[PDB]
Scaffold this active site. Structure first.
Site, PDB file in Angstrom:
ATOM      1  N   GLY A   1      -3.159  64.686  -0.690  1.00 41.95           N
ATOM      2  CA  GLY A   1      -2.366  63.501  -0.959  1.00 41.95           C
ATOM      3  C   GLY A   1      -0.939  63.867  -1.356  1.00 41.95           C
TER       4      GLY A   1
ATOM      5  N   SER B   1       5.667  58.335  15.754  1.00 42.87           N
ATOM      6  CA  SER B   1       5.260  57.109  15.088  1.00 42.87           C
ATOM      7  C   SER B   1       6.343  56.028  15.144  1.00 42.87           C
ATOM      8  CB  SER B   1       4.819  57.396  13.674  1.00 42.87           C
ATOM      9  OG  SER B   1       3.741  58.325  13.664  1.00 42.87           O
TER      10      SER B   1
ATOM     11  N   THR C   1      -4.739  67.430  -9.261  1.00 49.82           N
ATOM     12  CA  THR C   1      -5.042  68.526 -10.168  1.00 49.82           C
ATOM     13  C   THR C   1      -5.912  68.009 -11.311  1.00 49.82           C
ATOM     14  OG1 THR C   1      -3.060  69.675  -9.452  1.00 49.82           O
ATOM     15  CG2 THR C   1      -3.966  70.394 -11.551  1.00 49.82           C
TER      16      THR C   1
ATOM     17  N   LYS D   1       2.176  54.474   4.830  1.00 51.08           N
ATOM     18  CA  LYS D   1       3.281  53.705   5.392  1.00 51.08           C
ATOM     19  C   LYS D   1       3.323  52.312   4.774  1.00 51.08           C
ATOM     20  CE  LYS D   1       3.126  55.695  10.109  1.00 51.08           C
ATOM     21  NZ  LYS D   1       2.530  57.047   9.996  1.00 51.08           N
TER      22      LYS D   1
ATOM     23  N   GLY E   1      -2.302  62.988  -9.104  1.00 42.50           N
ATOM     24  CA  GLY E   1      -3.366  63.292 -10.052  1.00 42.50           C
ATOM     25  C   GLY E   1      -4.463  64.194  -9.489  1.00 42.50           C
TER      26      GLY E   1
HETATM   27  N1  LIG Z   1      -5.463  57.695 -11.488  1.00 40.25           N
HETATM   28  C1  LIG Z   1      -4.999  58.451 -12.479  1.00 40.25           C
HETATM   29  N2  LIG Z   1      -5.652  58.453 -13.668  1.00 40.25           N
HETATM   30  C2  LIG Z   1      -5.157  59.202 -14.668  1.00 40.25           C
HETATM   31  N3  LIG Z   1      -4.075  59.981 -14.682  1.00 40.25           N
HETATM   32  C3  LIG Z   1      -3.440  59.949 -13.497  1.00 40.25           C
HETATM   33  C4  LIG Z   1      -3.830  59.230 -12.382  1.00 40.25           C
HETATM   34  N4  LIG Z   1      -2.944  59.432 -11.340  1.00 40.25           N
HETATM   35  C5  LIG Z   1      -2.048  60.244 -11.837  1.00 40.25           C
HETATM   36  N5  LIG Z   1      -2.288  60.605 -13.136  1.00 40.25           N
HETATM   37  C6  LIG Z   1      -1.432  61.454 -13.953  1.00 40.25           C
HETATM   38  O1  LIG Z   1      -0.325  61.862 -13.182  1.00 40.25           O
HETATM   39  C7  LIG Z   1      -0.055  63.275 -13.352  1.00 40.25           C
HETATM   40  C8  LIG Z   1      -0.109  63.962 -12.008  1.00 40.25           C
HETATM   41  O2  LIG Z   1      -0.069  65.400 -12.220  1.00 40.25           O
HETATM   42  P1  LIG Z   1      -0.916  66.454 -11.349  1.00 40.25           P
HETATM   43  O3  LIG Z   1      -2.296  65.954 -11.075  1.00 40.25           O
HETATM   44  O4  LIG Z   1      -0.790  67.809 -11.963  1.00 40.25           O
HETATM   45  O5  LIG Z   1      -0.085  66.423  -9.989  1.00 40.25           O
HETATM   46  P2  LIG Z   1      -0.633  66.784  -8.537  1.00 40.25           P
HETATM   47  O6  LIG Z   1      -1.526  65.627  -8.163  1.00 40.25           O
HETATM   48  O7  LIG Z   1       0.584  66.926  -7.658  1.00 40.25           O
HETATM   49  O8  LIG Z   1      -1.388  68.077  -8.679  1.00 40.25           O
HETATM   50  C9  LIG Z   1      -1.058  63.789 -14.400  1.00 40.25           C
HETATM   51  O9  LIG Z   1      -0.440  64.151 -15.632  1.00 40.25           O
HETATM   52  C10 LIG Z   1      -2.126  62.690 -14.517  1.00 40.25           C
HETATM   53  O10 LIG Z   1      -2.533  62.457 -15.851  1.00 40.25           O
END
Ligand SMILES: Nc1ncnc2c1ncn2[C@@H]1O[C@H](COP(=O)(O)OP(=O)(O)O)[C@@H](O)[C@H]1O
Ligand SMILES: Nc1ncnc2c1ncn2[C@@H]1O[C@H](COP(=O)(O)OP(=O)(O)O)[C@@H](O)[C@H]1O
Ligand SMILES: Nc1ncnc2c1ncn2[C@@H]1O[C@H](COP(=O)(O)OP(=O)(O)O)[C@@H](O)[C@H]1O
Lengths: 531, 522, 186
Positions: free
Chosen positions: A114, A437, A121, A480, A119
């Site tokens: 994505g 596209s 990670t 999109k 989120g």
């Molecule tokens: N659905 C979600 N629920 C909880 N926290 C979310 C959600 N989506 C994004 N986040 C937050 O957004 C941030 C995204 O960081 P990270 O996951 O490290 O980035 P990436 O997805 O690029 O690896 C995190 O600190 C996370 O807590």
């Protein structure tokens, strides 16, 4: 010497005897044991052999972190810890159900692809604790060293095995969750092929009998949950791509972002500082303003940063006692992060003749890209700009031809495309396969230019067009459509073949957006230029 | 006993003690006669020398810390603001805190020097480290002890020398970090920027995990874009600005002048230097935002003065504007703007550069059925494409305004744009390019002392440019009267302090038809 | 010296005792044996000597893998494992039959070019089951290095040996089945 040798050997004996050890390992260790008994204390081999014993005893042979089976509790942990991600929540529940029928441990290989900062990670970190597995993060990225994975040769004094073996030394579980990052951003080196090393992991058969250059022992990883992360799909190598199941982890609209920001971002930022709710209070409206005007990211990494800074300026205030205890409101937020970065979402208010706003699934995520055309004073010509691939060049030629074709069929009295020199610009960011596209969009532009009747206000459209004017399905409708909503679009035009994908979206995403579906371009012309 | 002399006082974690006692027991069993005995002794010494449980007493007294930064440097309000957050936050934590802070900006602006000041303010150990064009990982991750001539990483060496687990690490020039045969050093750097790996960092020589979190990491850059992507997303950004003459004046007087006197050991009365001298020393000896130039010049005057005082041919040194030639000779840079009057087809442009705020010209010329453009310079693909858009926009624009003129559409044009602008800031001169071609068309030149920037779309919508702060500094230094910025860049312009923006007739535009009505009288 | 040097020497010899080893190989390893006793214990070159010596003895020599070569069973196995692919079935049963009549083992090279996910690879495993031959897999797709097959010189530090020998070290036998894949994307 012999008395002290026994104590050296016995400390390893007690370590291994608590494990469910495979037969070949004891034969290996006894051979190593027999050498140590004769090898002198000062011997270099003696030290490495003793070192080798530590590595093998560190391996959790038959040590499983008990995985608990509770549909409701698995859900509960994921629900509270993360917002949304229906698809991934369902896939993780699914992983529970299958493991349940086994009545034993289970392993699998998945990808979370994505846009960044959505989120990916964070979700995987929640899975480990949720399923009572030990969490680990490992990075391939642009690493070229194959030895990072497969280890170095044992005989070399001081050499170490692969880092995944080192993981099992730490985690003391045969059932870990290993996150592997940015596999789409694989590195190339002379030294070896990391791609093949990872393919030993992703291949289920090779996974059960993984080997290391130092360890020299076939280990079992069939129960290890491997989790990949990527930003884009196509850049992943083909063998890795097809030995693994891809899951789309979507970006967020305003409302989702807002619940994320209120429920998670704000208490994470407060816990990072050490503040209390009674000390620092933001508002719903504050964050709406912060989201809409101070972030352009599909994810929330950038909005996380903006929330962060807000609390940091609030923290400073409390210690010093400079002002009354911080309540943050739109009027006084200016002091915290400053003036509005983005005052408008898109490149124009109203498109002039020969400009179309098109949609594109960029590498980062969704965005709007306008398309624009221009005139220069026997046969006409087309000039094209951007870092256009040979693929898109050809497509544009076809678009150009289709446009011409459509003009004769419709208004043969006019002569515009066919006897004038035309230049159009297509902005970059669109991935190779996503390039076609905006084909039909090009077409719109050339026709728009011809009559000089502008595209009707705040209309979007994306799709590929054939040479006789048939529209093709385009990938990543999710992305999109997010983009169109962000950039304040009213009406959208899509291929009839993409009908499935659009109605898979949530309610709050598709609403306020009057969609049209189409199959051929003659339909589109009647939409974009009514009378 | 000697090893225990360190271990008894320095409270050691569990896993470390385990390695130490194993190594110590091995040392006892091993014959002192053997070479490997000394390997163990060297290894044990390293382990004992590394601090354990000697975190520096963090003086979070905010009021005192405030004063320390303020007296040491002039301006720098934004950077100090970020630091003063750091103590405050650390107070709410109630303990030491670890963070990564980036100072990007032009050279000789004060990134290294300010770093020193924070260290003073926080009472942390100032350690200085340099990647620059580093190609090897062994500088960080150490060389394996088995190989000949092996020595652990400087990070490890730092801890030993500082005798504390709460240092401040300066790691300068990360933006142009090198690459080589052994791989990418950026990988090792990611191990430092991630707190997750800081708690469990290991060396090929040390072979022991160490917690180096709660440490303030400071890095400097010259340009933002060139910094690796994985580091950049992880990184926190701080802009560190340029200075006008009047700012530079104050810097010289308060800091540079006494600093040179302090370094020379010379009394103030001995070697008198005045404000007016430095006014000339800026206008005639410097043309960049950095004070490296001004610092070397003050050094030069005072270095000569030292000779003058000691020798006794002039045992009283006083400097006046008519006596400056005695120490520095004639003015190096006599003129500031290299066209005093711009002829037709020439326009003044603006750029952001690694070396800092820059001032550049743009010029076009003829060459003798369809016209042609020959863009020249060490210019990238983007700029080439942008120029085509610019050229096309020029074409578009002329038929609209005055259709009878067929100059640029039929004739063959050669165009030149000076280099230095980063690829990212490359397109910013787009707007100026158009100005040049239209100027070339009627042969009526642009109005005098006019500098201008912006990207232009194929239809003529202008777009925002980055680093307006430095761009405006440079346009002031080169003495423009009037400046035209994009309407969406209005944010940056009013963010600026008032003393820089004095006497600039600024105009804000969305579309190039506005530029055309401003750059040309009627 | 008997504690370290001779222990390494002995363990590798009685390993090799059961292997039918060519004459040229004994001369190499015996020279290595003499070297190990000659060289200092704690030297880096000792480790390399010990390294080279280990690999030489680990590799099987004249240890020919056995097979049932009952043709009825062989065809039954393949038919039970896969549907379709009679052509490849036909070829490989011809191969066993040819081998059988010769009253000796045979080593030939065969290739299946097919569209992706059609079952080329899974057939490979079926062959190994039918043929009682040890299996191994190696990919060459996107690969640009001779040294992973041909090996690095044993003189070098951080030397990475030939891939093929690792298989032979894995199998501990001759008459292996190697699948070589993505040969067109070399
Ligand atoms: N659905 C979600 N629920 C909880 N926290 C979310 C959600 N989506 C994004 N986040 C937050 O957004 C941030 C995204 O960081 P990270 O996951 O490290 O980035 P990436 O997805 O690029 O690896 C995190 O600190 C996370 O807590
Ligand atoms: N704003 C300022 N206030 C005080 N001193 C300054 C300022 N800017 C530069 N200096 C002087 O610059 C000198 C060295 O600058 P330096 O830290 O090397 O710059 P850079 O890090 O940009 O190369 C310092 O000794 C300091 O006195
Ligand atoms: N003839 C067949 N009968 C049954 N299943 C088959 C047959 N051929 C292929 N398969 C299936 O193909 C899959 C393996 O394909 P694979 O050999 O990896 O593809 P490729 O030929 O591209 O390497 C298995 O899931 C297997 O069941």
């Amino acid at each position: 010497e012999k008395d002290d040798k026994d104590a050296i050997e016995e400390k390893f004996r007690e370590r291994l005897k608590e494990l469910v050890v495979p037969k070949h390992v004891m034969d290996v260790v006894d051979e190593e044991l027999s050498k140590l008994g004769l090898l002198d204390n000062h011997s270099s081999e003696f030290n490495v052999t003793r070192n080798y014993l530590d590595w093998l005893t560190s391996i959790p042979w038959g040590k499983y972190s008990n995985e608990n089976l509770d549909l409701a509790r698995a859900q509960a942990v994921l629900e509270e810890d993360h917002y949304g991600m229906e698809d991934v929540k369902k896939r993780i529940l699914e992983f529970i159900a299958v493991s349940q029928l086994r009545g034993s441990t289970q392993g699998k290989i998945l990808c979370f692809y994505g846009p960044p900062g959505v989120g990916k990670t964070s979700i995987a970190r929640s899975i480990a604790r949720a399923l009572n597995r030990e969490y680990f993060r490992f990075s391939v990225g642009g690493m070229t060293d194959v030895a990072e994975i497969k280890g170095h040769r044992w005989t070399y004094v001081g050499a170490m095995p692969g880092k995944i073996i080192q993981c099992l030394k730490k985690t003391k579980t045969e059932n870990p969750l290993i996150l592997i990052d940015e596999v789409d951003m694989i590195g190339r080196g002379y030294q070896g092929d990391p791609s093949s090393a990872l393919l030993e992991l992703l291949d289920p058969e090779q996974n059960a009998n993984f080997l290391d250059h130092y360890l020299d022992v076939p280990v079992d990883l069939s129960k290890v949950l491997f989790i990949c992360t990527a930003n884009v799909t196509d850049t992943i190598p083909e063998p890795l791509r097809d030995r693994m199941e891809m899951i789309n982890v979507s970006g967020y609209v305003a409302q989702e972002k807002l619940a994320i920001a209120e429920r998670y971002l704000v208490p994470q930022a407060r816990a990072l500082c050490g503040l209390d709710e009674s000390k620092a209070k933001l508002s719903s409206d504050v964050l709406t303003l912060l989201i809409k005007q101070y972030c352009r990211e599909s994810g929330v990494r950038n909005l996380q940063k903006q929330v962060e800074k807000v609390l940091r300026k609030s923290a400073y205030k409390i210690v010093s006692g400079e002002a009354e205890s911080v309540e943050v409101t739109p009027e006084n937020l200016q002091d915290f992060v400053g003036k509005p970065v983005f005052t408008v979402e898109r490149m124009y208010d109203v498109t002039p003749p020969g400009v179309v706003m098109g949609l594109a699934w960029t590498a980062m995520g969704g965005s709007t890209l306008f398309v624009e055309t221009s005139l220069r004073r026997k046969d006409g010509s087309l000039e094209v700009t951007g870092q256009l691939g040979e693929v898109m060049k050809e497509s544009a030629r076809i678009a150009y031809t289709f446009a011409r074709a459509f003009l004769m069929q419709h208004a043969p009295a006019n002569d515009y495309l066919v006897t004038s020199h035309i230049h159009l610009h297509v902005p970059e960011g669109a991935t190779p396969k996503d390039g076609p596209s905006a084909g039909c969009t090009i077409v719109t532009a050339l026709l728009s230019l011809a009559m000089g009747r502008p595209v009707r206000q705040n209309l979007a459209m994306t799709g590929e067009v054939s040479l006789t004017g048939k529209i093709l399905p385009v990938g990543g409708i999710k992305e999109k459509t997010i983009a169109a909503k962000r950039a304040g679009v009213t009406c959208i035009v899509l291929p009839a073949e993409n009908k499935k994908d659009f109605y898979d979206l949530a309610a709050f995403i598709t609403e306020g957006l009057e969609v049209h579906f189409v199959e051929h371009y003659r339909e589109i012309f009647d939409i974009a230029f009514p009378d």
